[PDB]
Amino acid sequence: AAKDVKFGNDARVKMLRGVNVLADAVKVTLGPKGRNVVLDKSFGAPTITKDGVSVAREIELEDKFENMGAQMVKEVASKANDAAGDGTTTATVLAQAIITEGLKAVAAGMNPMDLKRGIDKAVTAAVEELKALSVPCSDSKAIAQVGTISANSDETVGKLIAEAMDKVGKEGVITVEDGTGLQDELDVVEGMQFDRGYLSPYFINKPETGAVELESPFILLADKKISNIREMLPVLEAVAKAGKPLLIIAEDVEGEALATLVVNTMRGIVKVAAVKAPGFGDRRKAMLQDIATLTGGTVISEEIGMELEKATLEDLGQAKRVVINKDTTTIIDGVGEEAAIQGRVAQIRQQIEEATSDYDREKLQERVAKLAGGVAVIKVGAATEVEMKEKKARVEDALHATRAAVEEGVVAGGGVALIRVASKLADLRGQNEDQNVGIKVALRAMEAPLRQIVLNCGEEPSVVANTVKGGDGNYGYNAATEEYGNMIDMGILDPTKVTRSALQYAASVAGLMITTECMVTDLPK
Amino acid sequence: AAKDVKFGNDARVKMLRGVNVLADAVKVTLGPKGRNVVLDKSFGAPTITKDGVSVAREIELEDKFENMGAQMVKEVASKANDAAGDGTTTATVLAQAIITEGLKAVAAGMNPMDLKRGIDKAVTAAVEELKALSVPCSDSKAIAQVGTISANSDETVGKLIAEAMDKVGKEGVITVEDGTGLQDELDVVEGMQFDRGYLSPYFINKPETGAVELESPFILLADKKISNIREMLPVLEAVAKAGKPLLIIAEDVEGEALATLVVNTMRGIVKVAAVKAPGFGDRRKAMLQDIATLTGGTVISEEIGMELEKATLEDLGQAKRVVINKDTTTIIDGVGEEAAIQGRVAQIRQQIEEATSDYDREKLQERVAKLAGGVAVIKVGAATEVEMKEKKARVEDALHATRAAVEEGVVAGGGVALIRVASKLADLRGQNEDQNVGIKVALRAMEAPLRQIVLNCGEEPSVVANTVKGGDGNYGYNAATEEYGNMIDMGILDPTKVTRSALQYAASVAGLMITTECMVTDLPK
Amino acid sequence: AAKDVKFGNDARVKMLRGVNVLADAVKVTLGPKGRNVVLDKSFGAPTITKDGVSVAREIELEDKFENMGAQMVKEVASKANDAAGDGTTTATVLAQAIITEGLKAVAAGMNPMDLKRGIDKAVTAAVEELKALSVPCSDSKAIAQVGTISANSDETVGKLIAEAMDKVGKEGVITVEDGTGLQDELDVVEGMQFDRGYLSPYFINKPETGAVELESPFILLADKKISNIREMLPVLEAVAKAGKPLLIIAEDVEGEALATLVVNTMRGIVKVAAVKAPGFGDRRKAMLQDIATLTGGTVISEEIGMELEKATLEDLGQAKRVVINKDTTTIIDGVGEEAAIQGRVAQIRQQIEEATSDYDREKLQERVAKLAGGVAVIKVGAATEVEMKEKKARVEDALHATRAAVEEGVVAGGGVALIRVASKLADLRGQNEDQNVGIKVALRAMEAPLRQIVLNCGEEPSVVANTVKGGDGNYGYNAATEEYGNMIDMGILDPTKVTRSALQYAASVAGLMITTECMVTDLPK
Amino acid sequence: AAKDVKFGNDARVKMLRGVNVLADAVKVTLGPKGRNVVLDKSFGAPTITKDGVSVAREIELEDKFENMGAQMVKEVASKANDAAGDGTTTATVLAQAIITEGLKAVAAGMNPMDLKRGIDKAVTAAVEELKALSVPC
Ligand SMILES: Nc1ncnc2c1ncn2[C@@H]1O[C@H](COP(=O)(O)OP(=O)(O)O)[C@@H](O)[C@H]1O
Ligand SMILES: Nc1ncnc2c1ncn2[C@@H]1O[C@H](COP(=O)(O)OP(=O)(O)O)[C@@H](O)[C@H]1O
Ligand SMILES: Nc1ncnc2c1ncn2[C@@H]1O[C@H](COP(=O)(O)OP(=O)(O)O)[C@@H](O)[C@H]1O
Ligand code: BEF
Ligand SMILES: [K+]
Ligand SMILES: [K+]
Ligand SMILES: [K+]
Ligand SMILES: [K+]
Ligand SMILES: [Mg+2]
Ligand SMILES: [Mg+2]
Ligand SMILES: [Mg+2]
Ligand SMILES: [Mg+2]
């Protein structure tokens, strides 16, 4: 199809307009006191929200080049959120600040390479200072405090998270489910987790979380590529009985069988979830065999000459609950008999004793840790049902926050860590008058989060920013109570990973947009 | 799809225009002497109404942003009506007054946060004063007078309501049905009510009330999630015989089964009503078993290994009449034999004697109260049929009014309670010159109901408002007779819940619109 | 359909506009530091790329004559890339330079014949000088260095390529496959390669490479033209069992059977790849028989009176892996037993001893070398999977580079060889004042690659070009480190075939455009 | 009459565009290998000239902000012709170069008055050096 092509400043102005529209819509919700955005709906009353993810989801522009700019910033913010677990609006704010200043500089006649170099060196220095500023969070008390803070001053949630990480290790697997009464019950079962997501996004039955959930499902353990429906039709017919879902774990499922399964799921004949087998090479079969032993199943591989046609319900495995994420699959409470679990664990342990390679033994300890660690289950108790659901959501968010906090520590919240590092780095210089303009652009953009937070609350950003810069350590401004104080003592924290990820991804997208020479899109016809 | 995005005053002006159109259309019907609105119809002659609910239902705007404003106000007015049982037009009037003044203030340069704070504190003070004014209505005589007033001076309606509440308790279940002759007959049967509405809005066969009604229906007591039609085809086939409706009470019905049932109901092959089982956790099965023993049925649960395929008409329960609301299900006159119900009551009573927790014994007290209280039935007698239907509607509205009156008491009607509180609070002050503008906005908007009532009747609002403010207590203006006097003695009352709900929801929507920074809607294409 | 016809300068201006748009979009990505081009996508976030092939693929123009110019340059650039393995962007840059200057000269009144003659003689002289500069690369050490350089300083890739070419000869067959662990394993099996591509482009299941890949496929060895499906239904029905793909190698497949096979592949019933038999005449049957012996099959020829209807799985051959390219078919690890292979080799060797013609014996040595050489397999080992895939792609590109390097040697990269030859040929003269304008146009366009590389890096092209011209030998500019030095020592090489092919194809397309008198296209309706 | 008001960078880019139009017309005639400019005259035949002030006195633009820029830069050539009788193309070239680099420095956040003071100091020192560098003729 015929294309529209733009070069140079003509492309830059369109990207700048799109970025400004997106960020202007999204940034008014930053902080604890964000303003309201009314999002229209096809039918009924609109949606009034203070969340930036929701606002960014429904932002689409009629002009194609401005739409390119908006989508470019949006997908980088999504990447930052995925990597860190939080920080979409902050990353968007940083990206807009850097992009606006840098594109103004480029339009004046400066060398884009020098600006990009200055921005990159400023960001690297800031990241080093951020590492210097961070304080470790590894002991139980700090973990509980971080959980309570992330649960909006809910001490029970932090208590449960601390108990779970003390039970199954801080690097283990934790899952939350619905409870029965008002009691928060925690228990340990046998399971494992491997990083393979669903093959198609059309299998998702929980759009609230964007994940696939199965209750007491059968699993097909095929060590081959699925190529024809005729191979799986008897298995599908057997699964249709008793009304139980089926989980497909095989080497790969290509177009025709994937389309058949997607159509079946949409019309609801049989609910099927498909996931690729973990790993590759000769270790993939070991991973699959460990899964089969955990779930008490049988591996169907062409090497043994086994056919999916002659497969009954016996060969399938059974698990209590299975959760499939975008890029992660969790198996919880397999029915595989436990003495067989001990026998397999002992066998691979003896293999470990025979390991002669560093990488090989590392993979073997990975396998034994996955197989013998188990998973932790936290059951949410409440009086009514809606509060139980929102409490479960709070527990999930607190788990995501606590994982990053344990990974890299915590820094003062409210946007004051970036102010600390920017005030530290005020002496940084570049080799060129254009690399100096880039260094000033990146350091000026670290005050944007706190300034926008104070602006949303309704005070004067300049006075509060000056007062915070004048202080030292964790001195900062509490937006909820409109008073100053030590941010740690007021319980306003951010994990270091969130801040670092947001800053780095904003700088990345800004550098990509600064050195862009052409944009090609379809005609507006 | 591409979106249109507006910021700031550009959004505020559009919301203001939409709110003005909606409220100007709806407020001319307020009071006993409202004017006429001519609503067009697809075919034939128009509809002429003095009711604001009907007028608000058919208001749409061609401009998208103004339509967002109108729908925003309409949805909050509907919330107020649902919470209090009455007060849609009053809530719309209060909301328009506050929104207009506050948006004018915001456009002039005042700070939205301070305005919202002033409005909120004025409303809280008004609510406290309204609680101060209210007088109790708990004894039988006051209940009878409130019922008579709510039934347009119909003493028989109040007599029946007072008898029913003295019979089955002021917090019991009361239902009204069609009678046989001219006699108003009241009787007590065995029944239960639980707060679970219909699964889909397409099951409603009575658009006049917006409720589902079933006569002698069978009930399916399934303690499992229903997902495949093949589980229920035999049961549906059995139900199709004898031409009796079926009510589904289960854990949940997912996409395809719900769609199949909706299609079957729409084409009328079998009339089916679907409703979710009450509660959750381990108590949900207790409630389901109590329902089963009430209606003489059998619980079909996968734990016992029972299948819906091998289910005949025997396992189903039978009830004389079942009514389903938007969020409430009522079962009247179950065929369950009384000795089984009494033995169940004794069993849970012995459980209560063994209760060791306050909230646990609270659930148990709720259960025994629901199971042993029963329901009251009021049968409407009249000479003709149209008169009987109109009297039944009057009885229903009187029941809704009397419930709120018992819950929170009564205050003088005609809009004079709000004048009383506004005149009381004339000394209230704020911390800022912008919080003072907010306080004056909220207190000035409390005279809007009485002024609009007097304007609709045809007098001068200012003279009557001044005369009423001059008085004290229950002194007020009768719009029907154009005469002053004591409101209580002339029988013009409002429940305190209606006034409080209208004021609070109006202030809520006004605060939402004041602090709105962006509006995103689809392109007009 | 009605056409639009343009003559002379009206056609030239449109072609010039199209060529300018294409080259302006594509050339900003040239070198190690090319800028970014944002390519819109139908859904989601755009594509940001620094690769000229991707940018050139998605360029279409709304104007039809300008689109002729763009497609004309694009197709010749693709030819150059196919012939040399690299040099699409460089060929585009050279073509644009020559075309622009030559068309400017033509529009002024100079004779197109003389301009074309001058350009042709300048290019021939440059090719001779480029042959003079080239340094041979045939010994193992130079091969290893060339492989390492082409693999981005990856010594293991070069080591593997050198080992493979030392095993199976520098003119042998090399194939890369996915490995198992982290070990790079190299082995030799029995196979052959013949230059026959897929019959239809719809059989390709690997759009990343644009090739057909089959795993353990059956092959149909038919020595006749296939035209009726009824001949080939039973064989496909047999093939559908066990879910194995089928490779069709016959004299030719006409419209009906090819369409049926394409439809079957598209809907995924049976995966079929079709290829024409190699050669022609009486040698074609000998080649087909050699393939059949290699794969342990049976030739189905009408001369023996064999029918495809009475063909079972026995007559088909089996191979471990088969790869089909655009114009090349590779058979790897046939199941043909080795003693039969040796007997066949001895038989054709005895035939060679009886050869009495030079060309005939040349065909016989071709046959024996292809039959007895075998193929080399290189297996890529890595830790993760994405790394393994990227490394395999790097190995493939290094193989393409090393083949050309062995074929013709290497010259200094960065565009300094063309500067060397242009500075050598500054004394060249033509017979006419119009042939002198053509000679200056061709020599001025040889500095365009280095100037564009330096422009993309951010320096001043004139100063760097002058410094490079002042030097001698392999002195040149390193764009990655912005430092001068000897190009060989910094490891910036470029095969002579790539440069020669790019220059020649650019001159060809320029000469075609210069002597073009008319352009016929469809109406814009 | 009614007026049009432009603030900041918009004004500066319009002004620089006008400066560039006039300077690009004038600068093609500089040196031993400069060329001629044909000037249309309402009364008579066109004049073919290689003089800087003759070309500069002729330029007027359609846009009014760009016309302001051109009208301001024209005074350099006018004054140079009035004072020395020669050297007007060189003056125009220098003025355009200074304006371009100064606007680049201003867009980087510098104070224009301090830049102006620095330019003045540099030019004063330069004139002293030029006086020191001459020889009698
Ligand atoms: N009470 C508070 N006072 C000041 N800043 C706060 C407070 N609570 C949270 N914050 C800060 O506000 C930010 C949260 O903004 P949010 O809307 O969550 O955007 P994001 O999704 O990008 O994190 C965090 O950086 C946090 O440090
Ligand atoms: N005879 C009367 N004189 C004065 N006011 C009255 C009289 N009867 C009812 N009202 C008042 O009119 C209001 C009823 O208006 P209505 O049209 O029902 O609006 P809504 O549905 O919002 O209550 C009540 O607040 C009531 O106090
Ligand atoms: N480090 C370097 N310094 C200078 N020139 C380089 C360097 N690396 C590669 N080149 C040159 O850049 C060219 C590669 O450009 P490329 O984007 O690959 O275009 P093409 O696809 O036409 O080869 C080669 O001619 C090579 O000689
Ligand atoms: F143009 Be100047 F007068 F030499
Ligand atoms: K928020
Ligand atoms: K009315
Ligand atoms: K490149
Ligand atoms: K001159
Ligand atoms: Mg957040
Ligand atoms: Mg009413
Ligand atoms: Mg290349
Ligand atoms: Mg002169």
Residue numbers in the entry:
A (entry chain I), B (entry chain H), C (entry chain J): 2 to 526
D (entry chain G): 2 to 138
Task: Copy the relevant paper text.
We performed a similar in vitro analysis on encapsulated MetK, by both cryo-EM and cryo-ET, for comparison with the in situ cryo-ET structures. Encapsulation occurred following the addition of GroES and ATP-BeFx. Reference-free, two-dimensional classification demonstrated the presence of EL–ES2 as well as some EL–ES1 complexes. The latter exhibited subpopulations with wide and narrow trans-ring conformations resembling those observed in situ, with density for bound SP in the narrow state.
